[PDB]
């Protein structure tokens, strides 16, 4: 590069990666790398696991998407062979099973927990689509025409935030660049071209709403995060959709993501452009529980471990994925361990050489993550047992 600092930075990345590759047998129990035709902006493991009898591997599936320059975009279902002859002329195959025609890049794709065949998608346009992949062929049509099972109206702009209610069937939330949060009941009688209008529109934010998340236990409770630096807590039982139950001045920059703790009904996390992950207690949102510092750039995704209550991970533009352990907060460290980071930082994943777009914890196999980057790479990996043990 033209700048010395720029040329060094590009070289350090390439050099760090070569070291990461050579050190993978020390840090991981599993590393699987796959280069997708196009980069995916989304990643989410489907909940099902198919164990073939007398086979040394199980088949896991994952929802992916495409992001292309000028080609036909697709919603993808990929199969992954994980441990429960394998030589290619690398160890476990990653394959695209379903390709469903999509209009524009898939900003986010999430399955409905009550019917995992149903997947809502965020488009680069105002509509939010719904697809039943069993109501579509495995091979897409060269017609290139996107035929969603439902078109959800209410937004004026594209977005990323998307969350299905785990306790209330068909209740879908969506966040948009238009500053709104839309709610739909996909069970409502559609109209026109399978078009369902927003049941409610929440207008509390005064900037781009980056994410939405339903509380995992209270079916009426959800949280939102925006570029206005706020975290907002909403109750659908209230009739005022312009004022949230709580407004939290969460960060010193844009708030890009949030995730509720799957084991503690009061604990929640937010990720920000201020390069920190904040911990929140719904019982006292005026005071921040803790700040996770060590990310070297804007954070875009936060996800709690589906298996361990004290574990969460964050990813962003710094091309790294950090895994944090709440139980290690305020622990004593030797001066040598202290220089590597805070005790709460359990692991740094340096497998990606580009911005991490999304990641997903495998719900059936503990410590397995799938992360997708802007350079088309998708990694299925698992840190070494010794990292989280002893």
């Amino acid at each position: 590069a033209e700048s010395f600092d720029d040329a060094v930075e590009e070289r350090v990345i390439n050099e760090e990666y070569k070291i990461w590759k050579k050190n993978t047998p020390f840090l991981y129990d599993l590393v699987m790398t796959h280069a997708l035709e196009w980069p995916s902006l989304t990643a989410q493991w489907l909940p099902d696991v198919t164990k073939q009898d007398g086979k040394d591997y199980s088949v896991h599936r994952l929802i992916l998407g495409t992001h292309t320059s000028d080609e036909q975009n697709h919603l993808l279902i990929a199969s992954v062979q994980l441990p429960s002859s394998h030589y290619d002329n690398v160890c476990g195959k990653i394959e695209i099973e379903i390709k469903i025609n999509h209009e524009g890049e898939v900003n986010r794709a999430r399955y409905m927990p009550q019917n995992a065949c149903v997947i809502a998608t965020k488009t680069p346009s105002s509509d939010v689509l719904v697809f039943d992949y069993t109501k579509h062929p495995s091979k897409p049509e060269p017609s290139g025409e996107c035929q969603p099972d439902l078109r959800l109206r209410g937004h004026q702009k594209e977005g990323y935030g998307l969350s299905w209610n785990p306790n209330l069937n068909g209740y879908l939330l969506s966040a948009s660049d238009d500053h709104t949060i839309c709610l739909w009941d996909i069970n409502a009688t559609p109209k026109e071209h399978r078009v369902i209008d927003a049941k409610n529109i929440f207008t509390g934010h005064t900037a781009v709403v980056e994410d939405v998340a339903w509380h995992l236990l209270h079916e009426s409770l959800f949280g939102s995060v925006a570029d206005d630096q706020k975290l907002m807590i909403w109750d659908t039982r209230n009739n005022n959709t312009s004022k949230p139950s709580h407004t939290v001045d969460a960060h010193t920059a844009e708030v890009n993501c949030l995730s509720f703790n799957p084991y503690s009904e009061f604990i929640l996390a937010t990720g920000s452009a201020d390069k920190t992950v904040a911990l929140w207690d719904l019982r006292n949102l005026k005071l921040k529980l803790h700040s996770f510092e060590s990310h070297k750039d804007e954070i875009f995704q936060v996800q709690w471990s589906p298996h361990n209550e004290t574990i969460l991970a964050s990813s962003g533009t710094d091309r790294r994925l950090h895994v944090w352990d709440l139980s290690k907060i305020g622990e004593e460290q030797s001066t040598e361990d202290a220089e590597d980071g805070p005790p709460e930082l359990l692991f740094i994943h340096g497998g990606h050489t580009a911005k991490i777009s999304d990641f997903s914890w495998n719900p059936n196999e503990p410590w397995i993550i799938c992360s997708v980057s802007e350079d088309n790479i998708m990694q299925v990996w698992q840190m070494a047992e010794n990292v989280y043990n002893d």
């Binding site: 280069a35 320059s69 980056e210």
Partner: peptide, 15 residues
């Protein structure tokens, strides 16, 4: 807000 990169096609390797 996030800026989407100008996506590159893979031939079975990075971008």
């Amino acid at each position: 807000a996030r800026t989407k990169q100008t996506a590159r096609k893979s031939t079975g390797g990075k971008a």
